[PDB]
Every structure is written in C-alpha cells, then in structure tokens.
C-alpha cells in the first residue's frame, strides 16, 4: 500500500486486456516493483490435482505470456497431458494482482534454442546437468559435474528437454486494493469476436 | 531479468539433515521470516481446479498453521469455494523475494465447522465486516456505487456484524510439501516430502 497504484482501467473498461497487461508491466518496471514477473504457475495432473511453483515470464506475446522450463519437470509432464494452466502475479508494493488463465503450448525447438542462448551463460552448466524435478540421488556428484561445465567458455548446447511454453490466454483478471475494501476486479474473457469485460464483486 | 534479487542469508540445514517431520521445517522457515522482516510471508498463491481439471489461482492469506496443514478463510460462493466443494485438491506456493525461498504446499481442503468460521469472522477487525457482508465474492459487480453505498450504511454500526452465509474457513490438510532454497552455484535446494502410511517420505529433487 506503499507505492502509488493507479487503476483507471477499472473505470474506463479498455477493450483489449493485452494492452492493459503491457501497460501494468511497464508501470511495474518503471516504478521499480521487485521481481514483478515472478509468476505463481498452476498446472494439474491426470486426476485434476493442482501443483504450483514460481516461473519467470520472459516475454509478452500477441496471445499471452511466455516462459521457459524443462519438459520432463513436473509442470512439463502435466502440461503435456493437460494444457490448461493459471498463473498469478502479486505485487506487494502496489497491492495489485494479475491472474492469467489459458492453455500453454510448447513452442518449436528453434525458439527454445534462442531462449537458451539468451540466458546468462552461467546458467548453462546446472540446467544441463540436472534433470529437473527427478529425485536427486547424489548432491555432490551433481555439483562436481556442473563445475566441469562451468569451467568452459561461451554458451553450452541447449539440453534436450529445455523448452519454451506460450500461455495463450482465455481470461485475465486485474485486481487492485480499491477504496474502503471494495477491491477492484477487472475480468476479461475471450469471445470468438474479441474480448468481453466485466467487474467482479470483491 | 530471469535473475533473482534475494540477498538475505537463508540457512537451510534441513536440506542436509532431512528432518522426518516436515511441519517442523515449515515452522522454522515461517519464524525466520517473521524475525528478519519478510514482507507478507503468508501471501499464498492458491490453485484449485474446475470440474475439467482446469486450474485457477489467486492470493489468499494463511491465517494459521494447524497440525495437518494450513488454514485460510474465504467465501463458499467464490470461484475457489465452488471449485473446492467439488474437487478438494489444491496447491499453494509462498515465495519470499528477500531470501530466495519458496514453499509449495499440496493437499486436500476441508471446510471446517461453522463454529470455527464464527470465531474467524469475529477475530477480523470489524471494519472489514461491511464490505464482506454485501459482496457475493466473484459474481459480477453490476453497480460499484450501490455496493459502496450499501457497505457504508452497514459501517454506521461501528462494531461486529453477524457472519455472512458463505463466509468459511478451509483447512488444507497437506499430502506433500517442497522447501526450495536458492542453494550454491545454482544447485537449488529442493526438499520434497510425501505422506506415507505413517509419517512422511523425504527426498531431494533435481533443480
Ligand atoms: C523466483 C524463481 C523463479 C523461477 N523461475 C523459473 C523458470 O522460469 N523456469 C523454471 O523452470 N523454473 C523456475 N524456477 C524454479 C521452479 O519454481 C521449480 O523449482 C522448477 O521449475 C520445478 O517445478 P516443477 O517440479 O513443479 O515442475 C524459479 C524459482 C524461483 C524461486
Ligand atoms: C494480498 C491479498 C490477500 C488476500 N487474501 C484473501 C483471503 O485470505 N481470502 C479471500 O477470500 N480472498 C483473499 N484475497 C482476494 C483473492 O485474491 C481473490 O480476489 C478472491 O478470493 C476471489 O478469488 P476467486 O474468484 O478466484 O475465488 C486476497 C487478495 C490479496 C491481493
């Protein structure tokens, strides 16, 4: 409640939520919100049990948001059989949330190559040696094998399984704290002609 | 940009020692967070799922840590409430930027008796009662001013209101948890617990 938190969209109801999304992220970066792109990303298994973890949104796309992960991780396995996902951004400084609902699709390997090459190279060793989310049987062995690759110069090859997902959005909500506890919820839903928009009760 | 910003020391001896009882690790971490001044440590990004297994998320606050798990309150008619009533399975993550810690909490949410919900409602500062009484959380809001005006009328009272129908307390009774620390040299420290027939199985996970 500590930085300014303007929400004129709640009055004016903009037609295109992708444009609001881009505006909120720009405002977050320029006012210096701490890790605004840390998304709590929910997926579910074949019984419909949810799982969560943080991932970083690396781009906004025409259809949604983009992140990278490993295909054999829990989220990658869930996504493979059930593409429906939801993520939330929560910015403590302005008391704002963004809720993002949709289906995530794995992008082609060339896109993954590029994502990999644009990471700081210090991240290649461990992300190459680790099989994300599998049982870790020997900590020291992993540390030693990664140190072997850390010593090398330049980028490493993209490991099989390193992959990029686009979460193509079917609904979003923008949430602000409002006045007198009337929290402001702007809710958008894709239609076959564009986007529908409504306010929700707090 | 993909970088974490945490700089506070965050001792994670439990990654080496593998305590048998994961709720002790949850208590340690939460108490550490309290002592070092983490901002809103208990803002929980909670996921539930609809009848087709499609997830939804929002932040709720963990109001208590119980023997079985963690407690929060909400409205039974909300999206999360309707989802939990049909599919009790849920997952929440806490993430603390200052220490680079994450806590993932998975299990089944059970609605606790009304006496519990009465208690929880009463413990709320009564200033929160007016808006929570007039709002049917997550249904469309047709007229913002009518809502504001109606709460303001109730706020005249300057005291506790009766608990609304729908106001409720869920306990998330945990079946699995992960404690995640940044570790050294990007070997992120992942301590994973899963309920057994008695006690818990524990393992480490690859970063
Ligand atoms: C701030 C933060 C950002 C993270 N960003 C990513 C990311 O973008 N991609 C990723 O695979 N894991 C990321 N992780 C690690 C994930 O939370 C998780 O440990 C890993 O992806 C395995 O999740 P899973 O076992 O649920 O599939 C991040 C962790 C933290 C705490
Ligand atoms: C910091 C913060 C804490 C919140 N705590 C709660 C809470 O504990 N209980 C609750 O019902 N909603 C809480 N909310 C509001 C929810 O995020 C959400 O707007 C509301 O519960 C409706 O969720 P739903 O439509 O997905 O069911 C909180 C919001 C913020 C940003």
Swiss-Prot record, chain A:
* Residues bound to substrate: 70, 119, 127
**What reaction does this catalyse?**
(1R,6R)-1,4,5,5a,6,9-hexahydrophenazine-1,6-dicarboxylate + O2 = (1R,10aS)-1,4,10,10a-tetrahydrophenazine-1,6-dicarboxylate + H2O2; (1R,10aS)-1,4,10,10a-tetrahydrophenazine-1,6-dicarboxylate + O2 = (5aS)-5,5a-dihydrophenazine-1,6-dicarboxylate + H2O2; (1R,10aS)-1,4,10,10a-tetrahydrophenazine-1-carboxylate + O2 = (10aS)-10,10a-dihydrophenazine-1-carboxylate + H2O2; (1R)-1,4,5,10-tetrahydrophenazine-1-carboxylate + O2 = (10aS)-10,10a-dihydrophenazine-1-carboxylate + H2O2
State the needed cofactors, names only.
Answer: FMN
**Pfam families for this protein:** PNP_phzG_C (PF10590), PNPOx_N (PF01243)
What Enzyme Commission number(s) does the record list for this chain?
1.10.3.16
User: Which top EC class applies here?
Assistant: oxidoreductase
How is the co-factor bound, per the entry?
Binds 1 FMN per subunit.
UniProt keyword terms in alphabetical order: Antibiotic biosynthesis, Flavoprotein, FMN, Oxidoreductase, Virulence
Among PROSITE patterns, the record links this protein to: PYRIDOX_OXIDASE
One Gene Ontology term of the molecular function aspect: FMN binding
A Gene Ontology biological process annotation?
A: pyridoxine biosynthetic process
Q: Pathway, per Swiss-Prot/TrEMBL?
A: Antibiotic biosynthesis; phenazine biosynthesis
Residues binding FMN are: 53-56, 68-69, 74-75, 97, 132-133, 185
Its job: Involved in the biosynthesis of the antibiotic phenazine, a nitrogen-containing heterocyclic molecule having important roles in virulence, competition and biological control. Catalyzes several oxidations in the terminal steps of core phenazine biosynthesis. It oxidizes both hexahydrophenazine-1,6-dicarboxylic acid (HHPDC) and tetrahydrophenazine-1-carboxylic acid (THPCA) and thereby contributes to the generation of both phenazine-1,6-dicarboxylic acid (PDC) and phenazine-1-carboxylic acid (PCA). It synthesizes phenazines in their reduced form, which are the likely end products in vivo.
Quaternary structure, per UniProt, is:
Homodimer.
**Family named by the database record:** Belongs to the pyridoxamine 5'-phosphate oxidase family.
Q: What's the protein here called?
A: Dihydrophenazinedicarboxylate synthase
Organism field: Pseudomonas fluorescens
